[PDB]
């Protein structure tokens, strides 16, 4: 019976493991019986997330309902070469691992432009391929970073709201970002941050591709969840 998604992931909540927080990546064994011990799943660190802007808190309990869950070995896309000029993989001092005081979630890649910033972009489309094993469900984790007006213009060539949509399995999501006047930081790494991230997931059923349409600040998916089977959650 599983309680935590990743045993041997100490100091990690189920939502930390679901997002691939640094120090929170490890074996997630199979289980036919599971207890749902968190009604409102919570993170214990990283860059601060505006969790309730999306359904992201259900992700551990969705994984909980599968018999087998595992984090993919390869990146679902090449984030640095994704559309929108060349990107640098952003890291934050809020997300350390054993060999770096900076880092970021292993499920996502912070696409930071490289003096192609100045160009604010019209909406860009990337296709998210199915990479799991033949009969498995793929859960794709993505999101977007936003910041205050001055930092949005510094990181990106735009201080205006960016808009993000996702599509898979006939299910569409849509978002517009927020500049400044953010909620207080909660469930994060504990360092002050002028911006936040919004994190979402989309399910890709066996053999089904995904689509993300984005602008500046996108968090492109890297490591996806490959899940199969069915587990009795209690």
């Amino acid at each position, epitope marked *: 019976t599983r309680g935590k998604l990743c045993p041997d992931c100490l100091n990690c909540t189920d939502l930390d493991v679901a997002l691939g927080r640094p120090m929170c990546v490890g074996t997630t064994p199979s289980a036919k019986a599971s207890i749902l011990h968190e009604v409102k799943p919570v993170t214990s660190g990283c860059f601060p997330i505006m969790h309730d802007r999306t359904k992201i808190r259900q992700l551990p309990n969705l994984l909980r309902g599968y018999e087998n869950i595992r984090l993919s070995t390869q990146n679902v896309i090449d984030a640095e070469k994704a559309p929108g000029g060349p990107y*640098r*993989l*952003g*890291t*934050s*001092g*809020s997300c350390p691992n054993a060999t770096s*005081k*900076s880092g970021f979630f292993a499920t996502m890649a*912070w696409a*930071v432009p*490289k*003096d192609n*910033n100045k160009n604010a972009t019209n909406p860009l489309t990337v296709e998210v391929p199915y990479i799991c094993t033949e009969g498995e469900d793929q859960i794709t984790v993505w999101g977007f970073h936003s910041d205050d007006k001055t*930092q949005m213009k*510094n*990181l990106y060539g735009d201080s205006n709201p960016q808009k993000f949509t996702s599509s898979a399995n006939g299910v569409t999501t849509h978002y517009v970002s927020q500049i400044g006047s953010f909620p207080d930081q909660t469930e994060d790494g504990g*360092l002050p*941050q002028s911006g936040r991230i919004v994190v979402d997931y989309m399910m890709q059923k066996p053999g089904k591709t995904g689509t993300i349409v984005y602008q500046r600040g996108v968090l492109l998916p890297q490591k996806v969840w490959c899940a199969s089977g069915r587990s009795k959650v209690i």
Partner: antibody
Amino acid sequence: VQLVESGGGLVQPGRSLRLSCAASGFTFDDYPMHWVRQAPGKGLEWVSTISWNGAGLAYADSVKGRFTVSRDNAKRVLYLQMSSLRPEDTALYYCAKDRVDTTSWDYYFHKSMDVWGQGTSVTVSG
Amino acid sequence: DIQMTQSPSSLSASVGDRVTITCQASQGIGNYLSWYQQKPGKAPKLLIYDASNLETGVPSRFSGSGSGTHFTFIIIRLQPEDIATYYCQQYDNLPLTFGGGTKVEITR
């Protein structure tokens, strides 16, 4: 890998000065860069640090509010705009490369400095 | 702010002698300390980084050790070209701070 500081000279107190550091021989925009100064006969003193993009700045308290670090990644130049210059700003100003190509700009974009320039000398005097 | 207390301020030892330089942090900097060598009339050079890693090209007679608040820089067999002032520097937290330096000279 080469760093070449320039722009040092004799300034009257209260005036402004800009030092430039011409980087070459490495991918300059992957790395944080540093300014370190040294009064004659005295030890190394850190001035400023800038992240790989322009979004992360850091200053010693001696210079906060008076100095501005900046960079041109296309030109591959690190800048240090010094204003309201004081006689104790007199020093040899070193350009320095970070050993690690950190992508972060919020915290800890600073590690050991593996390449230094030969410095440009600034004398603040009337 | 973290002071780096470096000692001795100056020393002089014969060729082939052992040189021991210590750097103290007023607070825990963990691993993030480096050692620089500044020869007379020259700019600093990285010898040691992350308290024990020996930078490219620098000889095996140089070695560093320590963590937390205490760090040790050692020249195992002093050589005439080691005439310099050596500096420790912490990069664990802002503001970045250096040690006062340690002048090494040959007793010949």
